[PDB]
Amino acid sequence: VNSFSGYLKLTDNVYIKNADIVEEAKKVKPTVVVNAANVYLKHGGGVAGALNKATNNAMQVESDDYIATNGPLKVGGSCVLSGHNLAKHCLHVVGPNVNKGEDIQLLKSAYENFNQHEVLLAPLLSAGIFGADPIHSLRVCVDTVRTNVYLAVFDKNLYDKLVSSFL
């Protein structure tokens, strides 16, 4: 039993809710919140910008130190950093950005990172400003993630389409 409330169940292990992931995180304080990161951990916009803003830029400060030490992530890769005031940990996951020409086959590799965590709050990877088809992102999620994932979809119109078209 967990504290995630109001989700629709899509599969044994995948759940979905129309919610602002920022407000959802501040409410549940999950062990892991997933960020839709880029390889430089520059949290300028989209979900990343919103999460970082909610941490008063502390996420960005921590991220800049991470990159200075370790260099950029791989597309499809991830790192675990602090969740600040939002969660215990933030799993920064880099889905392919279609508006950068990056291989969509990398989306499966990106979702595989979720399997290292028993329960996560997450956005749809490569969706939004990353330019991929969110219906496709949801299919890859369900077919790749085996751990318990609670998906927050900010756009109500998109949420209804995802639910109504889900096979």
Chain residues binding ligand A1CJT by CB under 6 A are 20-22, 36, 46-47, 50, 123-124, 126-130, 152-155, 158
**What minimum distance in Å lies between the beta carbon of 21 and ligand A1CJT?**
3
**What minimum distance in Å lies between the beta carbon of 155 and ligand A1CJT?**
4
**What minimum distance in Å lies between the beta carbon of 88 and ligand A1CJT?**
18
**What minimum distance in Å lies between the beta carbon of 22 and ligand A1CJT?**
4
Residue nearest to ligand A1CJT (CB): 128
For ligand A1CJT, the closer CB: 21 or 106: 21
What does the chain look like in DSSP terms, one character per residue?
--S--SPEE-SSSEEEEE--HHHHHHHH--SEEEEE--TT----SHHHHHHHHHTTTHHHHHHHHHHHHH-PPPTT-EEEEE-TTT-SEEEEE----GGGT--TTHHHHHHHGGGGSSEEEEPPTT-GGG---HHHHHHHHHHH--SEEEEEE--HHHHHHHHHT--
For ligand A1CJT, the closer CB: 68 or 93: 93
For ligand A1CJT, the closer CB: 81 or 93: 93
